[PDB]
Every structure is written in C-alpha cells, then in structure tokens.
From TrEMBL, chain A:
Organism encoding this protein: Thermoflavifilum thermophilum
Protein name: TIR domain-containing protein
Pfam families for the chain: TIR_2
Gene Ontology MF annotations: metal ion binding
UniProt binding sites for Mg(2+): D442
Domain spans labelled TIR: 5-132
Keywords: Metal-binding
Gene Ontology biological-process entries: signal transduction
UniProtKB/TrEMBL annotation, chain B:
Organism: Thermoflavifilum thermophilum
Key words of the record: Metal-binding
Residues noted as binding Mg(2+) 1 in the record, renumbered to the chain: N419
Coiled coil: none
The protein's name: Piwi domain-containing protein
Gene3D superfamilies the UniProt entry points to: 3.40.50.2300, Ribonuclease H-like superfamily/Ribonuclease H
Binding site for Mn(2+): K162
InterPro entries, per database record: RNaseH-like_sf, RNaseH_sf
Keyword DNA repair in annotation: no
Amino acid sequence: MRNKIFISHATPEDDDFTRWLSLKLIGLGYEVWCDILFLDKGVDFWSTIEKEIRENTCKFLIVSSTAGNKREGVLKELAVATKVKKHLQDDMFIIPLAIDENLSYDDINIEIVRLNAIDFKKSWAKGLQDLLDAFEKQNVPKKPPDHSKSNLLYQQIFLHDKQAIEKEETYDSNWFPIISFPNELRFHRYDWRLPKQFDVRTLAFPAIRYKEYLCTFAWEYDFIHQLPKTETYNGQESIRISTSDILSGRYDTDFIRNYECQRLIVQLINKAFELRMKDKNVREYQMSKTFAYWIEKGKLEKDKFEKIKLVGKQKNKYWHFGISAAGKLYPSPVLMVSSHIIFTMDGINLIKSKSIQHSSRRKQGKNWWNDKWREKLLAFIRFLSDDQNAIYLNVGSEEKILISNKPLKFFGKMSYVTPSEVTLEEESVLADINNFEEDTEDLDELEDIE
Amino acid sequence: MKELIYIEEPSILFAHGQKCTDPRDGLALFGPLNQIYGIKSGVVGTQKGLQIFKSYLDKIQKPIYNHNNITRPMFPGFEAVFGCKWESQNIVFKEITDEEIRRYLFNASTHKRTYDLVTLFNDKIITANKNDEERVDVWFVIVPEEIYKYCRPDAQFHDQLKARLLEHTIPTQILRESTLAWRDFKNTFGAPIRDFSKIEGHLAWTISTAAYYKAGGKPWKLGDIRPGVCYLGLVYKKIEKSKNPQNACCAAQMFLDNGDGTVFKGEVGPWYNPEKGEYHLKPKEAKALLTQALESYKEQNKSYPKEVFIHARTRFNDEEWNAFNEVTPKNTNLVGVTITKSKPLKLYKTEGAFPIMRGNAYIVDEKKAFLWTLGFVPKLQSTLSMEVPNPIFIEINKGEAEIQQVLKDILALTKLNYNACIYADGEPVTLRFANKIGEILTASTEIKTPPLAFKY
C-alpha cells in the first residue's frame, strides 16, 4: 500500500543475491531500495535507512543467511521493521528469504522463526515467482516493466569504476628504428666469377643471389677476402642505386621495380643481423624460419644485466630470455624484435625435445607481465648494443647499418586506472581457463599460428 | 611518436531491446533475445554419466559463485537467466551401457577407435530421434572421461560427430563428466584433476549458454549493426589424406547481425600451393560458391547481399576477384580483407604489470591496420590475453572500404560467439572455428551439405 519495495542484506558478504534480486525487481517495474544501488555514499546512512524503512516502503524482505543472522546492522534494521509492522497491522511486512542452505530454524531470529518464509535456495526463479504472486495477492504497487532502468542502473553502479578513462599515455614497442643506411646498394655482374652452384648466403658479408647478378651493400673489391679471381672485376659494369632513392620508392626502372627492391633490402637486413649476432657472445637457437639469440649461464654478473634476470632457475631447469629480429621498410625502416624463452639443463645443451620447450614456455611466461617483458627486452637490446645508443650491423668494410636502441614510442589517447595486485590467483586459473570444455585441440592451436 | 586510436566497445543486443557489452551480465539481467518454451533435453551416456547429468541439472538452478566474481560473474540459475525449464524430469535418456563401450575399446588404432565410437554415438542418436515422436531439443552426448582420455593427444570426436549429425541435420552438444563433476575426479593424492572451484560459475555459464544456443534459441546479437549489411567470410583447409597435395577444401560462412552463421560447403579443388602457402580458388568453383551464398541470402531476406567480406589469413589473386565481381551485381560493394595475427607489434606499457587494453587500433595506411583484441579489459579488471597481447593485423586485400568501418565491424563480429560465454575472443568468429569447421568438412567431404545454420 506504500510507495516502493525495500530489501536489506548483509552487504559485506552476500552481494550477489542482493544484486540479482534488485536488478530483477527493478526490471519488472518494482521500485527497489537497497544499499547496493547507493554506492559511493553513506555518512549518516543509518538515519536514511531508518527513515525509508519508517515512511518510504511497503516491503522489507530480508536475507536469512548465516552472515546476516547476527550482523548488528541487519539486527537493528530488522528491529525497526518490527516496530513498523507493529504500527501497521500488515503481518506480511517482513519476508525472510532463505537463500542459505545451512541455516536451520534454531539459529534463526526469534521474531523471524514464526514468520512464513519464501524459499529461494531451491532456485532463484521459483522464489522470484513466489514473491511476485505474493506481491500480487496483497496488491503490491507495480510499474510496467522497463529494463532500460535496469540497464542504466547496472552500468552506473557496478560499471562506473571499471571503464576506460580519457587521458593520454605512451607505451613501448619492439619496433626499433634504423638510424642510417649505407650510401648505396650495388648489383655486381660477377657472371663467370661467381659460380651458380655455390650457396651465396654462406658468404661472410650479406650477399643474396638475384638472377645472374649479386646484390650487396659491400664493394666490388671488398669481397676478395674469401673468394678469388674477382680482382679482375671492374666498377663500371656494377650498378649502384642510392639507398635513400631505392627505399623512398621514387626509383623505378625496367631492370628492377620498387616492389622486389624492398624485399631484397629486407632480406639483406635480416642476413646482416644474423651475421652480426655471431660475435656478440650470445648463443643461437634454430626456429621455423628465423633464429633466436640468448645468454648462456655464467656469462654475466650472476646472470643479471642492470638488475634484470635474463637467465633464471625454475624447478630442475634454467630459462633464458632471447630475441629474434626481422626487418621491414614500408612503415618507415624498422626492425621487429620478437621475445622468446629458451630452456636449458644448466647453461648448455638445450633440451632436444622441443615439445617440452614450447609446452613449458607458457608456464614460464605465465608469471611474467608487462614489466617483466619490457624490462627484459630492453635489457637484452642494451646488452647487444656496442656504442652508447646504437647497434652496428656490418654489411661492408666501410658501410654499416645503425639500429637505434630506443624503440618507437606509440601513445594512445585512452587510458585506465590500474587496480591492485589481482593477478595472484589468475595464473592458477588460466591453466584451467582453456579447460572449460577441454575439447579444443591444444596442440593444433599452437600449430595454427603458422 | 605514432598515433593510436581507440574504438568504443560494440554493444550486443539482448531481450526486451536491451544492449550491453558483457554477454553474461546481459543474459543474467534480461535473458536471451528470443525465449523458448523449455529444453526437452535428450542425453546419451553411461548410467553413472546420467547421474552426473542429473546432478549438474540440479546444481544449475541453485546459484553458483566464482572465487572472485568480478572477472567471472555469478550464475543466477537456469530459469533465472533464461526464463525456461530444463531439468531431470523432461529427459529422454538412451541406454549406452558401458558393455558395448568396453567391446569397442578393444581396438588399438586411435583413428579407428574414435571413428567407431563416433559411429556408435551417431547411430544411437539417429535411432532415438527417428524411432519415436519425442522431440528432443538438444542431444547432450556425454563422453566418458576414459574414452576421450585414451583417444586424445581424424582423432577429435567433436568435429566428426558434428559432421555426421549435420549430415543427419540434427543438433547436438558434446560434454564430459569431468567438465561436469570435476569434484568427483581426483589424482593419486586426492587433488582435483582440474580445479574448477574458482571458475565453477563461469563453467556453468558457458555450459548453459551452449545448451541454450543448441536448442534453436539465439542468446544475443549485435545491437548496433549497419542497416542491410551481411558479412560473408571464408575458410580453407588442406586435405592431407589425398596423395596429391594441391587439392583443398573451402567453405563460406555467412554471418548476419544475428550471429548464427550459415556454412556453405565448397567442392574439393586444387588450391593448396606448397610454394607460397596461400590458397586461391579456381574461378569456376569460386563463382559457384559465391552464387550459392548470394542466392541463400536472397532467399533468406528477399534481397541481394551487400558485403561478401571474405576474411582469411591468406591472399586472393586477380582471377578470383574478377570472378567474384562478375558474380556480384552492379549495386553491391565487394571487399576482400586479409586478417592475420602473426605480425609482432607488442606494445608494452611504460610502467606496471597490466598490459594494454583490448580495442586499441594502429592505422598503417588506408588498407592495413593493427587491432588489439586481447589484453586488459576495463570492465573485467583483468586480461583476456594470458601474456602481453599481440594484435591482429587486418589488411583490405581488395575492394574499397573505410578502414575504421571494417575495424569496428570486425571487433563487433569477434564479440559474437555462442559456444563459449566469454566477454570476447581475440580471433574473429568467422575464423574462431576455422580449424574446427575445416576438420568438420574433411570429416564428411563427399556428403552434399545444404545451407544450414552454425548450430549443426
């Protein structure tokens, strides 16, 4: 006969049921009162609760839970409700809801035992239907259902502190820019000088076979170190294109188009990086297409470079951080660096079974978040650096490529607020978050990446 | 110092015309878009497995809570979320007593073992649903944990069983009692094999959502879809069974705003190229498949389709696009988009441990972009990606289309997935089950499959 329905609960403990009931009741049209919808409020909250109980409610239905059975706030609001029920002779003003399956009649409150409770522990829908028909059978005021109100309240209460905010912040990529390039790229017409059966990529300097020519950044007489009878070669028949011209794209001729030139330069960059990694006192690991490079045990100050552990123990084996490089030119000349983890017994003789390697790589990276990725990657890049702020790729005797140490700094206009340390239990459950059905082929998922 | 663009979360539509980002919260607050009058479920499984199914059904009505309940919300109960009844009274159970199971466990060839088990399950299902008039809404086939444990590293059960029952045009759902009663499964020292005590609520959520979708009901759909637009994507598979490698299988997957896609089978053709690895259809069968999909849309909507958004992890040559343009009418926009996730562009944060969001975009040109479909979620206060996310690289291979438009559309399309009730999945649904649907196709190749919904 009054205005709105009111419900109390043990807010610190049973918020799930109160949430469900409140949104389901407001969705059907009943104007609900509970402390859940009043988030970010409460100084004299008890006074407001007492006022709305006294003169702003027709219903008061309350949880009957072990936590809420003896809570002081629940007890005091229940006492105020009993006073209001004594005032208004309606004996159904108090509706216990037995959602708790281990609260017998012995420990239920004295003035709640004799009352008739509607069962919610069997199923919330059956209890909701019982409450609805009870509301109808003493003419509880109702509004036509409008779930728009439920949507508005749910997003502005349970989703107000967990939304992306508008403020600019920067990130850190693995796209390392190339500071400078050699002056020119030269195709030499070795012809009879260079045998076709010989594998060009095995040469000391980066050289890849293009038709009958040989395209390198080196010099014609620079390559006489390992292969003879090329001192007779002349610099006239060789064709040189300025690197800035060929990479820009404005260069185009019947000999070579701008499409294959960039791919050739990318392959040259990859080969140069692979050759340069030979003398950087790192160890190599073969992959499907590229190579990975890591640090052996005992090659650093307790295997730590600038307070960062690139190598660490785990159970009965060792893990080492490693990188793989691959160049690209279209969105400015950059080098992608991909981070991987390589497993070993102590510091040498990597595990022959790559299956264990890739399987336990996930369990070794499960506990490494953004910081333990970026810091290790930057530490590895700084370690591989030779001078202050660059890495030198020796392509020629006088020509070398410079790769900047600092990667490109992207920035986004949308940020958020980092919460407290919540991940502690995640790694336990993401080992099972793929086990919700376990039907998906885990082995095929890894193979599907290729 | 490059720029980044954030695309707002695409809301999905629920019952009573309600749209919200989280499928679980929307379902629990408003229910599925189209209600149904109950799930007359039929279950095939062992007597003990039948007891597991009954116990789980009893457990569903009572609420289930996760450990944190902030990243994996609560489970109110079946009739509380869906407004329909499904329990152990209106149940049509088929006796598959383990005597025949131990007879069929005598084989040693894993392929033959899973094949014969799938045939026995298929025969039981078809006999049950054709011998009598009891309309079983969903056939919940519960595989004993021994069967799958001894027959799992075709070899998978789900793909071939689904292929057989779609040949028989019959809905089904595969479940495991370990997924159902993990508490009853323990290792040597009594610890659970898979501790779901922290994710029990989400387990019930995903099982309930899959069960409801399999009953002909549509849980949700994209609520901010463009008027009169479809998305016809594509899936390939290589048939290694044949001695000649070039032959391959293809399948179109057409998705409307509803999210219940339609799979059109394609004839076997020589498209596997061992040199480059990117497959291309010959013009004849490609145009045949495109005409089939176009006519399916025409009969399903009394109008021509407008967006054959051929999504693939490969490229299309010139003759494929010439054939597609020839098939499509003049007043139709044709766009072929290549989507891949192997390009390393990990954007580590400056400080902290929580990675970048899901939904950040990086524009490269007018045809290529990077979309972050993994990582931290502001609402979930957690990360869908396990480690630092790697964005998916999308590229408009051919045709003219705004890059932000296709970015938002592909994000919204990733938001639509019924087989697993999660906030989102990184790969698009058109490619989510690409491996699964490809294995379904290669399981039943010579069978002529008419245009049928994704639930089969």
